[PDB]
Amino acid sequence: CIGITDRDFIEGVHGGTWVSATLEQDKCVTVMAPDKPSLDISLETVAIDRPAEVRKVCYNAVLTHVKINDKCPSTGEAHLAEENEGDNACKRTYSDRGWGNGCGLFGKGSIVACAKFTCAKSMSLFEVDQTKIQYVIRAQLHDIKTLKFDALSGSQEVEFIGYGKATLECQVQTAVDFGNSYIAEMETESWIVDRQWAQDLTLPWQSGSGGVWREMHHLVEFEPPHAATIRVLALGNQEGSLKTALTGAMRVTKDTNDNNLYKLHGGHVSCRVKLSALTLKGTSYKICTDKMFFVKNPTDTGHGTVVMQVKVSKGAPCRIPVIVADDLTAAINKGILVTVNPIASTNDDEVLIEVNPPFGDSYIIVGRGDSRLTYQWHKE
Amino acid sequence: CIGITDRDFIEGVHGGTWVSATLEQDKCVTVMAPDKPSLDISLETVAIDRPAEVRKVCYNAVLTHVKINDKCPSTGEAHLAEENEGDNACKRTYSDRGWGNGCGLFGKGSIVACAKFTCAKSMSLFEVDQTKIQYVIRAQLHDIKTLKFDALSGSQEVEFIGYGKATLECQVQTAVDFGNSYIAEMETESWIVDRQWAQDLTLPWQSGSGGVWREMHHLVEFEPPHAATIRVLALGNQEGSLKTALTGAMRVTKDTNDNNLYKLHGGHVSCRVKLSALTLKGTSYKICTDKMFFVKNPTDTGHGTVVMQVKVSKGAPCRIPVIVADAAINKGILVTVNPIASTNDDEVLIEVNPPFGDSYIIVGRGDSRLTYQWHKE
Amino acid sequence: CIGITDRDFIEGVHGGTWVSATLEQDKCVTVMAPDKPSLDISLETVAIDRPAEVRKVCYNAVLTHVKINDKCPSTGEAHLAEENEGDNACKRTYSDRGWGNGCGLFGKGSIVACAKFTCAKSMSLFEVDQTKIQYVIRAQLHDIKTLKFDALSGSQEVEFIGYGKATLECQVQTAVDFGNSYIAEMETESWIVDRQWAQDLTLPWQSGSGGVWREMHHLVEFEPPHAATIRVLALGNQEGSLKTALTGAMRVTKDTNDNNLYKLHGGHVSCRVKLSALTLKGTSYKICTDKMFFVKNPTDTGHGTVVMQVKVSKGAPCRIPVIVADINKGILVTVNPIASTNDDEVLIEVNPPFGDSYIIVGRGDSRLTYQWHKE
């Protein structure tokens, strides 16, 4: 993968040596020592295991067993047993009663209608427990070690050949704030949605400890009453509106092995590796200066950053400089570089670059001089 | 206590030496230096002080001073002064009025009933401010120093004899996500509940400011109106249902001392200790190879992991290896850091996070290794 | 500025040297090496740019085009097309109908009233993305370099002369919990409010996406119906009640220039600086032994802590010791409370225990004391 730098590791006169690295997915870091095999450490996955299901939202509903009870004037209020039953949606009203409908005197008469409510199609919402976030870090000598990590369980111990015992102290950083977000499951598909957005949906819902359906009236319509009948109509499937609303949302991908795991699109793990006293070797990187190509143009991550892929053909292993300025003068950088150590290991080699551009219109400038690439980006 | 290892500390050619340790409650870490007394550092408590009270949920209700106002047809809608008053639960309807009830003409007549609503028993909800969580770390030379730490205030300064000045920069990690959680108080008892669970409760509630009881209709029932009467009935005490729902929740203790402090049983503090340049001593621990038993069988944490206690019959000072496997390759995570037995015949805590479904918990190695069968739903 | 201590940095036989420091705004820390220029690192800003707008709350309402539909007994329920329009507030009820008002027989008659609802003045709520919090760190040799940091992007690299390349790995800590909080904007002013406090407000509201106003009935009143009319009245301006409630809240400042950025004022950044192998200088600070002054009296931060400023007349460069007493039962928020030079102020922030406490700063006859009530 990529090799650590001099400042990245430190060796004590006594005790151990510490390596501090930031690992991101699809990226690896390698550590090498004299008369010892090189060690490669990479971040494999960041994932969520069976997040709890907080709420169910209903976008298609069905009504059955329409029941009606009617009373004449001076006969009392009308009642139905289904009014007590939870599955039903009920309406209470008055209708015009007279000689026409079999009533002795002309007046308002009590009427009640009940219909059994069923949610044909529903959307699930899951809340992520941030202390349960899991990441897997894998280290292999040039014997493989797979280390399973938890936000709670930061420290894990491992033993390597020639390097001896080592301890990893890790922290997760995630690209999206799950305090403000839900994971929304519709059929096969899944998304990340704003919590308040989901809570404001004018559709029936059910708690995750299934209680009964709430605010059924959003998909239920009670027509104006006639003499002793009311028409109760379920509203049409609201999948179209919901799917249209979900276009501006970032998809989440279920893992391929377990398929009950959600895999986070981004975010990185900051680790400190403690080793027994060792002398390690670090490389130093030069800023690239020439010949860069856009293998993949900058594209929206969906969490407010843009990613690109670039090729370095000339000439070196070098660190790539990225800035985002609202000028072409590139005098003041207005952007933040999400990617850590965006480096080219070899010539003709592709590298990922993630950037957080300012709101409005900006220029993403990669490299320097006549050789530099530029791209124009709009952010809302 | 437990002694640090070589890799756990680092000494500079110049400047200071850094010790890196993660401390969890019920556990201590010690540092030793040649011709200097040993220093013991432990995490004493992690606590919350006077969490803000967000909401009160009412599971027992009482109705008193029932008032009714009636009108005949053609005289208008009925009104009560109590309709304007906040303390009351009111309902508006119509009743059949005729010569029987003193009305000249036959028709619907307006009727309103108001009843004074009182909460006999309520459940309180507290929200934890994650930046205000407190942890206390105690360091003693073989002179005690007590350090009060805050999530906001991570770095604190201390001065020790022979070790000189030291700076501790600490980070808290909490066992339960308080972004999704409330602390729920029912009488003497307290729990941790999901926020959405509490918010979805079909019971009356009251804001943290105070205000007025809301959605009173959950514990209030209005009978069908009669000629000039209505019966307003409060629903029964709902303590049984609430307690029943709260069986599957983890209790939170208060404080044997301050008694406005809630103590979090789990979660750990990861600290870096800065010392002036000195040479420390590091031990190394051997993997525990023989003879161990389960004094305390694996049990559910209430925060999604399982805890166990084990005793070592022969291995001296040793690292205990724990694995949770489906040929065993572990699919589980080890919550406990440095699960070490300093001496034989004294117990150690082990916390484990196993995968969903069925798993085997394997402790130790060789034929002497323990096993347990675990179901997670 | 302030200089690092011996323990704050560590130099390896091989590899790099690490300096670990915590920066809070309005404070700087400096690092020095022999035959090398001094390096100054400070935390300039902590901010949020365009936080997402979750909800709009309405404290002023306007009603227009009151439209009414009436029916006699035995003619059915009354309807208005305006009932289907999202913008109207509608009520359905009954009125007494008879020969007096043009009805053939005496009975209840259905009546519906609709009025157009407009929110003249509203309060906006913004939710902070904790991963999008930004902080700026400035490093200047004795040419300045400005680094923009993100909660997600902790590691950033910089190169200055003589020190070479350096890596900064930073962590943000914030004085206020944004998991439980909103940023509330009323006209020009903004505050930090409890999430549930805002959610529990008995006023109409509107979703962040936009859509339509909800629970309009909070600011709309329908008089009891007459023969064929209903009177629809909007309630008075509720700005006074809201601001009255917002006195006990901590104000947020929108900065001067771009100003879609909110500045968080408090909280600190815990940073580790990695440098190539160098010999640095560490200073040592002796405890400040005498002579202290209160230029700024202790006052509440509004997030549960108290802030003060002190001037030291004698002590030279010194560490200032702070205690909060019933042995201190309190927590010291401020890091490195040191006076770099005499007659220049130092900020000290403290988190005192609940009830009443004594704040003791310094030692001896020279020690200051203050009496503080925390409720």
UniProtKB/Swiss-Prot annotation, chain A:
It comes from Yellow fever virus (strain 17D vaccine) (YFV). N-glycosylated. Changing residue 54 to A: In strain: Isolate Brazil/YF-VAVD/75 vaccine and Isolate 17DD vaccine. Homodimer; in the endoplasmic reticulum and Golgi. Interacts with protein prM. Interacts with non-structural protein 1. Coiled coil: none annotated. It is a multi-pass membrane protein. The chain holds residues 288 to 677 of 3411 of the full protein. This is Envelope protein E. Changing residue 332 to V: In strain: Isolate Brazil/YF-VAVD/75 vaccine. Disulfide bonds join 1-28, 58-114, 58-119, 72-103, 90-114, 90-119, 170-271, 288-318. Residues 1-380 are extracellular. Binds to host cell surface receptor and mediates fusion between viral and cellular membranes. Envelope protein is synthesized in the endoplasmic reticulum in the form of heterodimer with protein prM. They play a role in virion budding in the ER, and the newly formed immature particle is covered with 60 spikes composed of heterodimer between precursor prM and envelope protein E. The virion is transported to the Golgi apparatus where the low pH causes dissociation of PrM-E heterodimers and formation of E homodimers. prM-E cleavage is inefficient, and many virions are only partially matured. Residues 96-109 are annotated as: Fusion peptide. It is found in: Virion membrane; Host endoplasmic reticulum membrane.
